[PDB]
Amino acid sequence: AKLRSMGYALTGAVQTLSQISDINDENLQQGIYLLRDHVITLMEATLHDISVMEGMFAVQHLHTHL
Amino acid sequence: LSQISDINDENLQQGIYLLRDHVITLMEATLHDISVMEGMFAVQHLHTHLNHLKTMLLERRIDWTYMSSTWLQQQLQKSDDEMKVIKRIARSLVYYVKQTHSSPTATAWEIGLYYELVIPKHIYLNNWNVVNIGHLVKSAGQLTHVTIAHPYEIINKECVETIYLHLEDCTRQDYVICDVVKIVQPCGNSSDTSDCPVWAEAVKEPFVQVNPLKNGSYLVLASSTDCQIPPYVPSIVTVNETTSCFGLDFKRPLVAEERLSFEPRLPNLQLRLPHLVGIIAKIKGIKIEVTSSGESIKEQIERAKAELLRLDIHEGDTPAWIQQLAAATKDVWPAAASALQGIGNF
Amino acid sequence: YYEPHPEPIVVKERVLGLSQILMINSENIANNANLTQEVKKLLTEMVNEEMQSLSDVMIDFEIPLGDPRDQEQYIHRKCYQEFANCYLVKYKEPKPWP
Amino acid sequence: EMQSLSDVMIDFEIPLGDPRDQEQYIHRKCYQEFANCYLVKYKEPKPWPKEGLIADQCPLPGNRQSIWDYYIKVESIRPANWTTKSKYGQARLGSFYIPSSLRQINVSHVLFCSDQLYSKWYNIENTIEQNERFLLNKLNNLTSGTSVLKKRALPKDWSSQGKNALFREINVLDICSKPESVILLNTSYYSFSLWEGDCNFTKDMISPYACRFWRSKNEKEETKCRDGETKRCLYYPLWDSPESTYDFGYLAYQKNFPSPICIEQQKIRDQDYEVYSLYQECKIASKAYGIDTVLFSLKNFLNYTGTPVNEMPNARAFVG
Numbered sequence: 001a002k003l004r005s006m007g008y009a010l011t012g013a014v015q016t017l018s019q020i021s022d023i024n025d026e027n028l029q030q031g032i033y034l035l036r037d038h039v040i041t042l043m044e045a046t047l048h049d050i051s052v053m054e055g056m057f058a059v060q061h062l063h064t065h066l
Numbered sequence: 067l068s069q070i071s072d073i074n075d076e077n078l079q080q081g082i083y084l085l086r087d088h089v090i091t092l093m094e095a096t097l098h099d100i101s102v103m104e105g106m107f108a109v110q111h112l113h114t115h116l117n118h119l120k121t122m123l124l125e126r127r128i129d130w131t132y133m134s135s136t137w138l139q140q141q142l143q144k145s146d147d148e149m150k151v152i153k154r155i156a157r158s159l160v161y162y163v164k165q166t167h168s169s170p171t172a173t174a175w176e177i178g179l180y181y182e183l184v185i186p187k188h189i190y191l192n193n194w195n196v197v198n199i200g201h202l203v204k205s206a207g208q209l210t211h212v213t214i215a216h217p218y219e220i221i222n223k224e225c226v227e228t229i230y231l232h233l234e235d236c237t238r239q240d241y242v243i244c245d246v247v248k249i250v251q252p253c254g255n256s257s258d259t260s261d262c263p264v265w266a267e268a269v270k271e272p273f274v275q276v277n278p279l280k281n282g283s284y285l286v287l288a289s290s291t292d293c294q295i296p297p298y299v300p301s302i303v304t305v306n307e308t309t310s311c312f313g314l315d316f317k318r319p320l321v322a323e324e325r326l327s328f329e330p331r332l333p334n335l336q337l338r339l340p341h342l343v344g345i346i347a348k349i350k351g352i353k354i355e356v357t358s359s360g361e362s363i364k365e366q367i368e369r370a371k372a373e374l375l376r377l378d379i380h381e382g383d384t385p386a387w388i389q390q391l392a393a394a395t396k397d398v399w400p401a402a403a404s405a406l407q408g409i410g411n412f
Numbered sequence: 413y414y415e416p417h418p419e420p421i422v423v424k425e426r427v428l429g430l431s432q433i434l435m436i437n438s439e440n441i442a443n444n445a446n447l448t449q450e451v452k453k454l455l456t457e458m459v460n461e462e463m464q465s466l467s468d469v470m471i472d473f474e475i476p477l478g479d480p481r482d483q484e485q486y487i488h489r490k491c492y493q494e495f496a497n498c499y500l501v502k503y504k505e506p507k508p509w510p
Numbered sequence: 511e512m513q514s515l516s517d518v519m520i521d522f523e524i525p526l527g528d529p530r531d532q533e534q535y536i537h538r539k540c541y542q543e544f545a546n547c548y549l550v551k552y553k554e555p556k557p558w559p560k561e562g563l564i565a566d567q568c569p570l571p572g573n574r575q576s577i578w579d580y581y582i583k584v585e586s587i588r589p590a591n592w593t594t595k596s597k598y599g600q601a602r603l604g605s606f607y608i609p610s611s612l613r614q615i616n617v618s619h620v621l622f623c624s625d626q627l628y629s630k631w632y633n634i635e636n637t638i639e640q641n642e643r644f645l646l647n648k649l650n651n652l653t654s655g656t657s658v659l660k661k662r663a664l665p666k667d668w669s670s671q672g673k674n675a676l677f678r679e680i681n682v683l684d685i686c687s688k689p690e691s692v693i694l695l696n697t698s699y700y701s702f703s704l705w706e707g708d709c710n711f712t713k714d715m716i717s718p719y720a721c722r723f724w725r726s727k728n729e730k731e732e733t734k735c736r737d738g739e740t741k742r743c744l745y746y747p748l749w750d751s752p753e754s755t756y757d758f759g760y761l762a763y764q765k766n767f768p769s770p771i772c773i774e775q776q777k778i779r780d781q782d783y784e785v786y787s788l789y790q791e792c793k794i795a796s797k798a799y800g801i802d803t804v805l806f807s808l809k810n811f812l813n814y815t816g817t818p819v820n821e822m823p824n825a826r827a828f829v830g
């Protein structure tokens with residue numbers, strides 16, 4: 001047994017945009033439009049505060065975040 | 067029950083079964099990580115754990131930190147994915163909290179936690195809501211909206227087969243949970259299909275309905291034609307170029323990329339209605355059952371006949387009555403309807 | 413017509429009921445972490461703060477199971493948490509360091 | 511934390527394309543795994559020559575220093591007939607001993623993964639994201655299609671045509687913090703000695719510490735026992751012990767008093783090193799064979815020795 005849901009991929013079609021700015025386009029319609037590319041994010045880069053902390057202080061800060 | 071393993075017994079029934087003996091747990095034994103930390107680093111790690119626990123309990127959730135997964139799975143006998151679902155939906159109750167010792171340097175406390183674990187019988191992932199659009203009918207002068215009472219609320223389609231679900235006694239704990247789920251057949255006029263009741267209702271003319279669908283098409287049901295669209299029968303409409311129809315702008319959709327579909331495909335169905343259905347819906351003033359999907363000609367007719375016969379000719383509204391007779395006779399004997407219309411206007 | 417229903421649907425079979433008792437004791441924690449008498453105060457404050465806050469919003473419910481005081485596991489674990497490493501030695505007869 | 515989250519959530523299909531095909535996913539994944547990882551090739555295989563290292567610029571125990579791993583202590587108690595020759599070969603007791611593992615004859619390449627050798631363009635005061643862009647541009651500007659760095663990138667010590675465009679030069683105190691890096695990568699051994707005898711420097715030839723040699727030579731090496739020529743016997747060392755002073759050659763290197771310092775060079779390796787970037791190789795090879803394969807292939811190369819270089823402490827992550 002191995003579960004996986006098609007709840008967001010049920011219809012067999014998808015409308016996609018190259019740019020978030022495109023969503024404002026007047027001649028669109030009410031509906032769901034997906035930005036075409038995935039956003040890719042490292043946590044090391046995102047959390048600056050832990051970068052300048054040291055030892056167990058760094059560790060406990062991250063724990064509070066996670 | 068003497069063991070958790072006993073919950074799986076086939077000759078049980080749907081109910082609540084308590085494990086007979088209390089699970090006893092020391093936090094010092096559970097939290098290994100603090101045991102190797104020293105000074106205020108230890109203290110602050112515990113503070114984070116305690117504050118988290120409190121947060122879970124306020125939301126009636128269970129913090130699984132204080133119970134062995136392997137032990138639970140080995141008692142329950144369930145797959146990895148079933149355990150995910152079980153652990154998502156389970157709920158907690160605090161029935162007591164008690165300080166047992168208090169010194170300026172030392173404390174002790176006790177907590178009584180009650181848990182209710184739902185055990186799944188089946189889990190359904192690829193689901194559709196029903197929407198009932200019906201049809202319009204014009205009968206002896208009256209516009210009528212007609213609908214079938216379907217015996218299911220959900221359609222499911224995991225792989226190839228499509229299943230029609232009736233639900234009872236449901237709640238939401240993240241997911242939908244139901245006590246009772248009966249599989250049913252769609253409607254039809256045959257032994258193998260459901261004999262569902264048909265409802266009619268009188269409606270005001272002109273009738274226009276236009277629903278913008280999310281994929282960019284429009285769902286139309288209208289008493290009148292525009293942009294070539296047939297009246298009375300509903301349809302899903304799409305245009306290649308923006309135009310005005312029914313007083314509003316049908317846009318061209320954005321191009322979409324294709325994917326594997328899970329859309330249901332219901333059986334078709336032919337439905338016969340009484341000749342005077344518009345009159346029957348009218349004199350009730352309410353949405354009324356007129357037929358069943360399967361029903362014989364004879365049973366369908368003997369339904370409103372005595373009622374309809376007792377709408378007899380009266381001294382007070384003869385012209386009005388004659389005009390209704392002409393509307394009723396038009397389709398049957400046109401040559402009699404024109405005559406009755408002339409006498410009526412006289 | 414139809415629209416998606418993204419959320420899963422679970423059919424119930426049965427419910428299992430459980431009772432768990434959690435026991436907390438700051439001295440056990442303070443021994444392992446080599447805490448000083450000053451930090452033992454901080455630990456004791458911090459634990460009472462969290463426990464008292466929970467206590468202040470929750471009423472008491474009767475649960476239809478037997479009393480924990482009658483159950484072995486309760487007895488064994490309570491005696492342990494308190495007395496595990498406590499011992500009494502008797503001299504043959506009373507003789508001090510000279 | 512991650513496991514707890516994993517345990518309550520099932521998988522859902524989302525109708526977009528595979529991340530593995532997307533450049534941002536490829537570029538960021540190669541970075542997170544191989545940003546600072548480089549392979550150096552010797553012109554031909556030539557080890558560090560001596561087992562004994564004279565390096566008085568480092569302070570002695572009595573902060574911690576990495577070179578104290580290789581420090582030989584002087585012990586007052588020894589067995590009967592004990593000699594340094596029997597244990598440390600030709601090292602001077604109270605200095606440093608370089609193991610045979612660091613001196614392998616056949617080692618042709620040095621693989622390292624650390625940021626500590628970058629030239630001034632790199633600053634830890636600047637932001638992670640900026641330092642990323644700066645490196646990413648430099649590795650594009652210093653490479654043409656392959657993963658080989660242009661000679662310009664190297665320091666002058668490793669190549670004639672080196673202009674430090676990526677890497678700084680190794681200095682005299684780098685041995686104390688980063689021993690292995692020097693022993694593997696230095697082209698020449700330079701001594702720094704305050705030991706009476708070296709460069710023929712006699713105690714008369716000097717034309718609180720002042721003008722003095724740190725360690726003077728004694729008459730010989732000897733031991734004496736008392737009917738117990740086994741376990742515990744008094745040892746008389748061939749040189750003095752620095753325990754009492756411990757700062758002398760450090761404080762001398764920083765010039766706080768004048769002293770008779772001795773420095774001699776000894777060539778080891780030709781100044782014609784070649785350098786490859788594993789980050790650039792990951793990007794490039796993933797365009798042909800896809801990232802899943804390249805990532806697994808290059809991860810195994812970081813474990814060529816049986817210990818993965820990327821899990822080592824930053825300063826000590828150098829392997830032949």
Ligand SMILES: *[C@@H]1O[C@H](CO)[C@@H](O[C@@H]2O[C@H](CO)[C@@H](O[C@@H]3O[C@H](CO[C@H]4O[C@H](CO[C@H]5O[C@H](CO)[C@@H](O)[C@H](O)[C@@H]5O)[C@@H](O)[C@H](O[C@H]5O[C@H](CO)[C@@H](O)[C@H](O)[C@@H]5O[C@H]5O[C@H](CO)[C@@H](O)[C@H](O)[C@@H]5O)[C@@H]4O)[C@@H](O)[C@H](O[C@H]4O[C@H](CO)[C@@H](O)[C@H](O)[C@@H]4O)[C@@H]3O)[C@H](O)[C@H]2NC(C)=O)[C@H](O)[C@H]1NC(C)=O
Nearest residue numbers: 013279281282283302304319322329330331332333334414
């Ligand atoms: C916005 O969203 C909406 C949806 O919410 C979109 O509308 C939907 O768009 C779909 C297209 O992507 C439409 O599907 C298409 O339907 C066509 C019509 O299907 C009917 O006619 C078929 C042909 O019938 C004639 O010919 C046969 C002999 O070949 C004779 O026997 C008949 O008597 C006729 O003469 C027929 O096959 C279909 O029958 C199936 O459906 C009905 C119910 O509708 C059932 O009663 C049947 O049992 C049958 O379903 C079963 O069997 C079929 C295989 O036979 C299986 O596929 C089913 O799963 C099920 O088991 C209908 O009577 C199709 O012709 C058209 O076919 C294309 O695709 C197939 C492959 O799938 C190719 O092989 C074909 O060559 C062709 O390319 C396609 O299926 C939906 O109808 C429509 N939905 C609704 C409710 O309107 C809307 O467009 C979206 N808009 C935007 C902007 O995105």
Ligand SMILES: *[C@@H]1O[C@H](CO)[C@@H](O[C@@H]2O[C@H](CO)[C@@H](O[C@@H]3O[C@H](CO[C@H]4O[C@H](CO)[C@@H](O)[C@H](O)[C@@H]4O)[C@@H](O)[C@H](O[C@H]4O[C@H](CO)[C@@H](O)[C@H](O)[C@@H]4O[C@@H]4O[C@H](CO)[C@@H](O)[C@H](O)[C@H]4NC(C)=O)[C@@H]3O)[C@H](O)[C@H]2NC(C)=O)[C@H](O)[C@H]1NC(C)=O
Nearest residue numbers: 667679680681682685692696698699700709771772773775
């Ligand atoms: C790993 O590899 C790195 C190189 O990347 C290496 O770092 C270099 O190490 C050497 C050796 O210490 C450093 O050179 C020495 O610098 C001394 C300080 O320089 C100042 O003074 C000179 C002029 O005196 C100025 O030009 C300069 O600008 C500075 O202001 C300098 O005193 C040394 O010079 C003496 O030693 C050399 C040895 O070859 C000799 O040629 C010189 O003429 C000079 O005289 C000698 O003095 C010593 C005692 O001081 C005496 O013993 C000897 O008898 C004299 N000999 C003669 C002929 O008079 C020398 O230039 C170099 O700067 C470092 N470079 C970097 C980048 O830091 C590491 O040491 C290597 N590590 C290991 C362990 O191998």
Ligand SMILES: *[C@@H]1O[C@H](CO)[C@@H](O[C@@H]2O[C@H](CO)[C@@H](O[C@@H]3O[C@H](CO[C@H]4O[C@H](CO)[C@@H](O)[C@H](O[C@H]5O[C@H](CO)[C@@H](O)[C@H](O)[C@@H]5O)[C@@H]4O)[C@@H](O)[C@H](O[C@H]4O[C@H](CO)[C@@H](O)[C@H](O)[C@@H]4O)[C@@H]3O)[C@H](O)[C@H]2NC(C)=O)[C@H](O)[C@H]1NC(C)=O
Nearest residue numbers: 255256336337338339357358359360361362363364365366
């Ligand atoms: C659900 O499905 C049923 C079954 O199809 C629908 O009811 C049927 O509707 C059709 C179409 O209107 C009717 O067809 C007509 O049948 C007569 C002959 O009927 C006699 O012979 C039948 C032989 O099988 C028999 O079943 C009939 O029995 C019923 O009626 C008797 C008498 O009242 C009753 O006692 C029984 O209990 C049954 O109820 C009966 O003995 C035929 O003469 C008609 O001919 C006209 O049409 C044809 C074709 O156009 C044409 O060629 C001729 O010239 C003539 O114009 C016509 O074929 C059928 O009688 C109905 N059967 C039943 C059981 O009602 C039902 O209405 C559907 N429900 C819904 C809600 O849609």
Ligand SMILES: *[C@@H]1O[C@H](CO)[C@@H](O[C@@H]2O[C@H](CO)[C@@H](O[C@@H]3O[C@H](CO[C@H]4O[C@H](CO)[C@@H](O)[C@H](O)[C@@H]4O)[C@@H](O)[C@H](O)[C@@H]3O)[C@H](O)[C@H]2NC(C)=O)[C@H](O)[C@H]1NC(C)=O
Nearest residue numbers: 282283284302303304305306307308317318319321322324
């Ligand atoms: C109303 O229904 C119409 C069906 O009668 C829809 O028309 C179809 O629309 C698709 C859109 O993808 C067209 O596909 C395009 O085809 C051209 C080249 O044509 C050749 O290739 C296609 C299949 O690729 C084949 O079907 C044709 O016969 C040709 O051999 C490509 O250049 C495009 O990229 C695209 O693939 C169909 O060809 C077209 N079929 C028909 C029968 O018209 C119409 O879009 C619907 N319109 C509205 C208002 O909803």
Ligand SMILES: *[C@@H]1O[C@H](CO)[C@@H](O[C@@H]2O[C@H](CO)[C@@H](O[C@@H]3O[C@H](CO)[C@@H](O)[C@H](O)[C@@H]3O)[C@H](O)[C@H]2NC(C)=O)[C@H](O)[C@H]1NC(C)=O
Nearest residue numbers: 099100101102103104105108441442443444445446447448
């Ligand atoms: C609380 O304080 C005690 C006492 O200092 C700590 O225990 C001590 O921990 C060290 C490191 O683990 C032990 O030293 C090592 O012992 C082994 C076995 O002899 C030896 O191989 C090593 O060379 C080293 O000497 C030390 O023996 C041990 N002392 C005692 C009395 O157990 C403890 O870790 C502290 N813990 C916390 C979480 O506060």
Ligand SMILES: *[C@@H]1O[C@H](CO)[C@@H](O[C@@H]2O[C@H](CO)[C@@H](O)[C@H](O)[C@H]2NC(C)=O)[C@H](O)[C@H]1NC(C)=O
Nearest residue numbers: 808809810811812813814815816817818819821
């Ligand atoms: C790095 O290489 C070493 C040596 O080949 C690998 O160590 C072996 O791993 C297997 C797999 O479980 C063990 O059964 C062997 O006993 C190990 N042998 C030795 C000599 O260690 C190691 O798995 C590799 N590690 C990584 C992170 O790549």
Ligand SMILES: *[C@@H]1O[C@H](CO)[C@@H](O)[C@H](O)[C@H]1NC(C)=O
Nearest residue numbers: 555610613614615616617618
């Ligand atoms: C080193 O290489 C030589 C020449 O190929 C060979 O004889 C020797 O066995 C190798 N030894 C080691 C330790 O690799």
Ligand SMILES: *[C@@H]1O[C@H](CO)[C@@H](O)[C@H](O)[C@H]1NC(C)=O
Nearest residue numbers: 706707708709710711712774
């Ligand atoms: C004196 O210095 C020279 C330098 O080349 C060396 O060859 C010689 O061995 C030294 N002699 C003594 C007695 O130290």
Ligand SMILES: *[C@@H]1O[C@H](CO)[C@@H](O)[C@H](O)[C@H]1NC(C)=O
Nearest residue numbers: 794795796797798799800803
């Ligand atoms: C891999 O093998 C396939 C054929 O199996 C070939 O088309 C392809 O060019 C080869 N090389 C790469 C980089 O995929």
